[PDB]
């Protein structure tokens, strides 16, 4: 029956890491290796699964995350990383097999549009009424920063600082964040996230053959 729809990936401006787009698939047939032949994969490292296996297994759900990402920040996009990307931008599950891919959009992939630059939330805290004490807001797994409400979808300058007033239910004070940037590259480089879940008598996201 039906085929898994990866099309959105190939058409638009992929968001920055902290605004990742997510496609969620059930009851479909996929050809992941076809998808990745459209790009220059620079890195493909999984956790509790393999590149070979993730292309050929049956799932209850396959979940795919995509965003613009500089290849020069490879060390921060890692299932073992403790940098700003897992702290404030993007964190995957530990209790499910996952994978992280680093690609480059080739010139003959012409429906993928570049943003001005790459930007990531380098700090997301919450300070108290004392305007000094800072309480980090670490991102949950599979979720966005609470501080994406105050960060522009693309940060104009390295170091820009954002602020918003909190009601007393949340402790008063401000929600505070700060952003860093990386110069856009000649070809758009991206990062992808894959997460699989296995079920009992309900594995319907299986490879096409």
């Amino acid at each position: 029956g039906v085929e898994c729809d990866f099309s959105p990936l190939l058409s638009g401006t992929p968001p920055q890491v902290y605004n990742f787009k997510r496609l969620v698939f059930t009851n479909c047939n996929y050809n992941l290796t076809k998808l990745l032949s459209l790009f220059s994969v620079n890195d493909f490292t999984c956790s509790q699964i393999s590149p070979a296996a993730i292309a050929s297994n049956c799932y209850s759900s396959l979940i795919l995350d995509y965003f613009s990402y500089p290849l020069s920040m490879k060390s921060d996009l890692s299932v073992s990383s403790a940098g700003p990307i897992s702290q404030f931008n993007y964190k995957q599950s530990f209790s499910n097999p996952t994978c992280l891919i680093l690609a480059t959009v080739p010139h003959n992939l012409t429906t993928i549009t570049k943003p001005l630059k790459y930007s990531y939330i380098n700090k997301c805290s919450r300070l108290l009424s004392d305007d000094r004490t800072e309480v980090p807001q670490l991102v949950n797994a599979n979720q966005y920063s609470p501080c994406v409400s105050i960060v522009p979808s693309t940060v104009w300058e390295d170091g820009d600082y954002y602020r918003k007033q909190l009601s007393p239910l949340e402790g008063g004070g401000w929600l505070v964040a700060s952003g860093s940037t990386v110069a856009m590259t000649e070809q758009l480089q991206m990062g992808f996230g894959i997460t699989v879940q296995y079920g009992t008598d309900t594995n319907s996201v299986c490879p096409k053959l």
């Epitope: 009424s129 009601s167 949340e170």
Partner: antibody, heavy 111, light 112 residues
Framework: EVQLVESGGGLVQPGRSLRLSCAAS????????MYWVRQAPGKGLEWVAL????????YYADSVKGRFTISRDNSKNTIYLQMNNLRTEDTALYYC?????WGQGTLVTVS | GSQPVLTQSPSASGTPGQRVTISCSGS????????VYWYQQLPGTAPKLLIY???QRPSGVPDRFSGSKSGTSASLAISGLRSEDEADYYC???????????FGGGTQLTVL
């Protein structure tokens, strides 16, 4: 581990007085607003009072304005809810929270 | 208990595995400029935070729970509806008019 223990609850005649406590552990207390929520048996939760982490401002429900007082001590990681001229509508289970963790309540009965 | 500022239509039906939502409606002084929190309470137990800051999920809550906030109303959707989901579900938010927090009427879901 995060724990939140109330006390003080009990029996009082209408219009009497009753002081509640709530001790906390397992987090940085001086970072959270703390507040009291009550539940009359078989009914919904109703917000009672809130006090900031600086013994700042306090907030009250119109049901309890002028009678209740919320207090706070950061050296003991403790909260107080003073209740005066209590009434039959003050019968409830008294919960103490930040937002993430709740406590097993304490009983307030009056009739 | 004198009527809450929030309207929580309290009946919520479904079936195992179904998706039931809980609609919490209010006014522009509470939902609309303030964050929503969602709570779950089992028969005779303390409440538990499910969703905070309208969409956020504390680690420990199953992924089946998620929250959203449009302009004036907020809702808690549940996928893969289970049997431990038989509980009472409440929304809450700050109110700039009362300068106090507001809870909803409280919905009870029953599913089997």
């Amino acid at each position: 581990e995060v724990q939140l223990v109330e006390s003080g609850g009990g029996l009082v005649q209408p219009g009497r007085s009753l002081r509640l406590s709530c001790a906390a552990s397992g987090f940085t207390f001086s970072n959270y607003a703390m507040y009291w929520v009550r539940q009359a048996p078989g009914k919904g939760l109703e917000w009672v009072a809130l006090i900031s982490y600086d013994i700042s401002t306090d907030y009250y429900a119109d049901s309890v304005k002028g009678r209740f007082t919320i207090s706070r001590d950061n050296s003991k990681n403790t909260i107080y809810l003073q209740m005066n001229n209590l009434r039959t509508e003050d019968t409830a289970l008294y919960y103490c929270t930040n937002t993430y963790y709740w406590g097993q309540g304490t009983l307030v009965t009056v009739s | 208990g004198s009527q809450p500022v929030l309207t929580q239509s309290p009946s919520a039906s479904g079936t195992p595995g179904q998706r039931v939502t809980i609609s919490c409606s209010g006014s522009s002084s509470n939902i609309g400029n303030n964050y929503v929190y969602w709570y779950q309470q089992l028969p005779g137990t303390a409440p538990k935070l499910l969703i905070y800051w309208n969409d956020q999920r504390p680690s420990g809550v199953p992924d089946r729970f998620s929250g959203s906030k449009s302009g004036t109303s907020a809702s808690l959707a549940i996928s893969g509806l289970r049997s431990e989901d038989e509980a009472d579900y409440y929304c809450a938010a700050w109110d700039d008019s009362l300068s106090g927090a507001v809870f909803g009427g409280g919905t009870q879901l029953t599913v089997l």
